[PDB]
Amino acid sequence: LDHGLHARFLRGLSAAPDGAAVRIGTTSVSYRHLHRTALLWAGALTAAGARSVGVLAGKSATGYAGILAALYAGAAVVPLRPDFPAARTREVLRASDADVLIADRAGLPVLAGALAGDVPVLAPDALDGELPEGVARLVPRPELSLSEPARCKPADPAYLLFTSPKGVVITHGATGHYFDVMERRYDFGASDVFSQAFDLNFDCAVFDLFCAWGAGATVVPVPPPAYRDLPGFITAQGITVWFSTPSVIDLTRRLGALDGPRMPGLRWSLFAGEALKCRDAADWRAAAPGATLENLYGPTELTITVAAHRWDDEESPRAAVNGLAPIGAVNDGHDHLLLGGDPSPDEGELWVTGPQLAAGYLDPADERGRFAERDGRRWYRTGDRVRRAPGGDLVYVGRLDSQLQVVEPAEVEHAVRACGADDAVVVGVTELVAFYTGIPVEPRELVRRLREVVPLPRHFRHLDAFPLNANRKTDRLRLTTMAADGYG
Ligand SMILES: C[C@H](N)C(=O)NS(=O)(=O)OC[C@H]1O[C@@H](n2cnc3c(N)ncnc32)[C@H](O)[C@@H]1O
């Protein structure tokens, strides 16, 4: 089992071959059935010489098997979003130099557009007349099926993932170090049931898949209606491990769904992608009291997550800064610094180096200003302002470049929440606009409260919800435009 990332799936296969690898609605696909499908598809990918495989698919059997088939063929997985604009998907195919495309039924309608810039398509569910004319089809033959998955070197690409817009090359070796280190934090086993909440083109979906599969556990895609009541969905499905952006907490709370211990069977409550508020952690924890909660942090260029904090109902609120839970300690095997060009013991840009470094970007020229040399080593400059609490825990404060002159928006946001908002986004237009959710407050009352907690924005906007970007993060760029249009 030295194959690479996909060796995690082989370990599940060995532990629960006939157990459910993926549960899609009212049906399951077994490890064994995914394995054989991937061997079959990989034989076709191998015969066509595939080094990079576009996976143009949703949360379908085809899409999960397509990921595995790509890895089984020794190729990088290049996830493509069927619901993304076709022209964007064209750019990604060009940039990644994808050799083959695997498409499910959600991918078919976008495929004519996707291929309108030599790239055969493996689309099991399609009829011939459903592929655009010109496009050659990969029809996997059982006689060319591999007898076993390709074995890859730690340097080989496993995944090509795009940030929000550069292509990041994630290696087998880096995911190998990642899962080795994350597995040791947890107690996953074959009876666990993992959410699959992240989109397939977002790096955290790799944790969903390979932590579950590494344990012989079951992956359960979270369909969009489920967000009307996440705790109901978790309990109905017997989900033991939950992982998402922490926006789902305020969402669930707002809908009245976060009242009482509605998730008794949950064991792990994991959040990544944006700042986690203390208050949000404690609220989720009351709703899922038998689940350990963790705040997981990191950028795509450091393989999935690169720091972790295990929430403690008593200690974490003490270490909190600006109402935000700590991001904790960097993953084992990594060093970090907080730079001001001089290191600080207290606060600065977080720089990290270690085995989880991406191999780099699809265009090396993009590395400059992002990857950096220091003390003979290669680091990733996160562009995040991070503080060290007493205790040693790191705490994320904000984007390094968010500072203004009129000011640290994150301190204003914290003051708005201490005055009663569920959440706040403070942006510049130079003056301040403070968007907030929660109970509406007349702005002169909000100012009175803010002068009481911090002895100020000139404009306050109440929203039912912040807008979210493609990754289900607060869309701060959208809000900055809303501010400029309204008050420029
Ligand atoms: C978790 C996933 N690797 C991710 O979100 N990658 S990303 O490249 O899309 O975005 C990374 C940025 O999200 C923010 N972020 C990610 N996880 C976070 C956490 N737990 N707390 C605060 N900020 C976080 C930071 O600004 C970070 O640099």
Report the C-alpha gap between 108 and 177 in whole angstroms: 36
Residue 113: both structure tokens together: 């557009």
Same domain, 363 and 449: no
In this structure, the chain runs to a length of 488
Q: Which domain holds residue 408?
A: 401-488
The structural domain count of the chain equals: 2
Classify 195 in phi/psi space as left (phi over 0), alpha (psi -120 to 50) or beta.
Answer: beta
**How is residue 194 written in tokens?**
């993992």
* Residue 423 shares a structural domain with residue 487: yes
Rg of the chain on CA atoms, in Å: 23
Query: Within this chain, do residues 276 and 129 fall inside the same structural domain, yes or no?
Result: yes
- The values of phi and psi at residue 442, to 5°, are -60, 145
Q: Give 206 Cα–ligand 1 centroid separation in angstroms.
A: 15
Expressed in angstroms and rounded, the spacing between residue 244 Cα and the centre of ligand 1 is 12
Decide which of 400, 416, 435 is a domain's last residue: 400
The counts of H helices and E strands in the chain are: 14, 24
CA–centroid distance, residue 178 to ligand 1 (Å): 16
Give distance in angstroms: CA of 222 to centre of ligand 1: 21
Distance of CA 34 to the CA centre of its chain: 23
- 406/395 same-domain check: no
Find, among 71, 273, 301, the residue nearest to 169 by Cα: 301
How far does residue 298's CA lie from ligand 1's centre (Å)? 5
What whole-number distance in Å separates Cα of residue 169 and Cα of residue 78?
Answer: 10
For 57-81, the DSSP string reads --SSHHHHHHHHHHHHTTPEEEEE-
Which contiguous run of DSSP H or E holds residue 272? strand 268-272
Q: How far out from the chain centre does Cα 25 lie?
A: 22
| CA pair distance 325, 317, nearest whole angstrom | 7
State whether 136 and 106 are in the same domain: yes
Any bridge partners for residue 219, and if so which?
Answer: 22, 194
Residues 464, 285, 476, 337, Cα dihedral to 10°: 170
One-letter identity of residue 282:
A
* Determination technique for this entry: X-ray
Is the distance from CB of 384 to CB of 400 less than 8 angstroms?
Answer: yes
The last residue of one of the domains, among 358, 376, 400, is 400
Helices assigned H by DSSP within 215-364:
230-237, 247-254, 278-287, 316-319
C-alpha to C-alpha distances, 390 to 312, 313, 319, 335, 360, nearest whole angstrom? 15, 17, 7, 19, 34
Candidate of 245, 294, 300 to mutate for ligand 1, largest count of ligand atoms within 8 Å of Cβ: 300
What residues contact 445, with CB distance under 8 A and at least 6 apart?
Answer: none
Closest residue (by CA) to atom 17 of ligand 1? 273
Give the pair of three-digit tokens for residue 76: 């990088």
The candidate with the shortest Cα–Cα distance to 10, out of 44, 43, 35, 45, is 35
| Two structure tokens written together for 267 | 């064991």
Q: Cα of 100 to ligand 1 centre, how many Å?
A: 30
Residue identifier of the C-alpha nearest atom 21 of ligand 1: 275
Q: Which is it for the CA torsion 236, 237, 242, 244, positive or negative?
A: negative
- For the chain, report the end-to-end CA distance as a whole number of angstroms: 59
What is the H or E stretch that residue 413 is in? helix 409-418
Given a contact cutoff of 8 angstroms between Cβ atoms, the answer to whether 158 and 183 are in contact is: no
Check if the beta carbon of residue 113 is closer than 8 Å to that of residue 89.
yes
Last residue of a domain, one of 346, 365, 400: 400
User: What is d(CA 302, CA 355) in angstroms, rounded to the nearest whole number?
Assistant: 8
123 shares its domain with 15: yes
CB 281 within 8 A of CB 294: no
Atom of ligand 1 lying closest to residue 396 CA: 22
CB-side neighbour CA atoms (13 Å) of 262: 18
419-457 core/surface letters (b: 16 or more CB in 10 A; e: else): bebbbbbbbbbeebbbbbbbeebeeeebbebbeeeeeeb
Q: Do 373 and 444 share a structural domain?
A: no
Rounded to the nearest angstrom, the distance between the alpha carbon of 123 and the centre of ligand 1 is 34
Asked whether 102 and 56 are in contact (CB, 8 A), the reply is: yes
Is the dihedral angle over the CA atoms 209, 325, 384, 398 positive or is it negative? positive
* Of 237, 175, 238, the residue nearest 210 (C-alpha): 175
Smallest Cα–Cα separation from 210: which of 250, 245, 233, 241?
241
Residues in contact with 282: Cβ distance below 8 Å, sequence separation at least 6, in sequence order: 313, 317
Distance 313 CA to ligand 1 centre (A): 23
Q: Which ligand 1 atom minimizes the distance to the CA of 301?
A: 8
Residue 237, classed as helix, strand or coil, is: helix
Locate tokens 């569910």: which residue?
125
Q: One-letter amino acid identity for 482?
A: M
Q: Return the biggest CA–CA distance within the chain.
A: 76
Q: Specify whether 65 is located in the same domain as 146.
A: yes
Residue 309 DSSP SS3:
strand
| Shared domain check, 194 and 54 | yes
The pick from 293, 396, 423, 475 for probing ligand 1's pocket by mutation, whose C-beta has the most ligand atoms within 8 angstroms, reads 396
Residue whose CB lies within 8 A of the most ligand 1 atoms, among 274, 356, 401, 471, for a mutation test: 274
Report resolution (Å) to 1 decimal. 2.1
What single-letter DSSP state applies at residue 132? P
Closest ligand 1 atom to the C-alpha of 383?
28
Q: Which residues line ligand 1 (CB under 6 A)?
A: 163, 203-204, 272-276, 295-300, 304-305, 327, 382, 384, 396
CA of 372 from ligand 1 middle (Å) equals 19
Q: Which helix (H) or strand (E) holds 483?
A: helix 476-487
3-state secondary structure of 343: strand
Tell me, yes or no, whether 453 and 368 share the same domain.
no
Q: Both 425 and 390 in a single domain?
A: no
Q: Could you tell me if 110 and 190 lie in one domain?
A: yes
Tokens in use for 207?
Answer: 């944790």
- The closest of 56, 298, 58 to 168, measured between CA atoms, is 298
